[PDB]
Copies of this chain bind each other. A is one copy, B any other.
Amino acid sequence: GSVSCLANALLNLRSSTDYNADHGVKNSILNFSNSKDASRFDGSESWSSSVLDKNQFIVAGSDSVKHFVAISTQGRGDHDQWVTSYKLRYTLDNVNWVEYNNGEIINANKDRNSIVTINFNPPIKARSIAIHPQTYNNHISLRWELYALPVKSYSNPSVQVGEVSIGDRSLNSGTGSRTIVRHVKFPVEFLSVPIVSIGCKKVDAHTDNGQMRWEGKSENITTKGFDLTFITWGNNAVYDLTFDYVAVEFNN
């Protein structure tokens, strides 16, 4: 129940340097492995830097605010190279970068294939995150994965808004439960059925010997629109009512 970001192709990767394109970040996913044919080179089972110093990195980014819950690193699958320690940096606004845990040096790998996982408690909240290898065996070469919370069903909703009124004297006389429907068409048709929230912004109504009774309900909601049912009861004479509505479409 966390998301493997690289496995799902959710993040753009950018390395500092690449030994060459056959050692690029595209070869860096956790457990990456390619042909065992020893007669041809189809790429390192790792990202491998070109320059060996303490300034190399891979930046992983996208526009969404991610809640990173863990990172896993691994050495290189096909040669004895691995990152033995690293630092992490991240940014929420893509302008100001901070060091994870005050520049903590994280102890990492000691062989080609064993996975080392660090859990973030609390999650790192970031748009971009960078692994900054500090020490290495033989070469700065690694495979990795970044784990994030799944997107919530309530995130990134679509919204259309409008207003609706009775607009005449339909409810301005009579006795007992009395209702009128105003059909509202959304400016644009939704892809799926939204919810429709409403709030009153005008009352022009007579009490029934002091009792005020008015109600609005959004009903018969479709992708194209909905009905605002205006309601009164007892003997109230309602002259006009106005609602603003906010139609919200989730998960689409």
Contact = CB atoms under 8 A, between A and B. Distances in A.
B12 A9 contact: yes
Nearest to A5: B94
A223 to B, nearest CB: 12
B197 A204 contact: no
Contacts of A35: 17, 50-51
Contacts of A152: 158, 188, 190-191
Contacts of A26: 14-15, 18, 21, 24-25
B17 A42 contact: yes
Number of identical monomers bound together in the oligomeric complex: 3
A159 B248 contact: yes
Interface stretch (A78-86, A109-117, A211-219): A211-219
A63 B60 contact: no
A202 B188 contact: no
B161 A195 contact: yes
Contact of A206 (B15, B204, B210, B214): B210
Interface in A181-240: 187-188, 190-191, 195, 197-207, 210-217, 239
A201 B213 contact: no
A12 B197 CA distance: 36
A151 B28 CA distance: 29
A62 B63 contact: yes
A38 interface: no
Contacts of A9: 11-14, 59-62, 128
A121 interface: no
Contacts of A29: 14
Contacts of A21: 20-22, 24, 26, 43
Interface of A: 1-4, 6-15, 17-22, 24-26, 29, 34-35, 41-43, 50-51, 59-65, 67, 91, 93-95, 125, 127-128, 149-161, 187-188, 190-191, 195, 197-207, 210-217, 239, 242-246, 248-249, 251-252
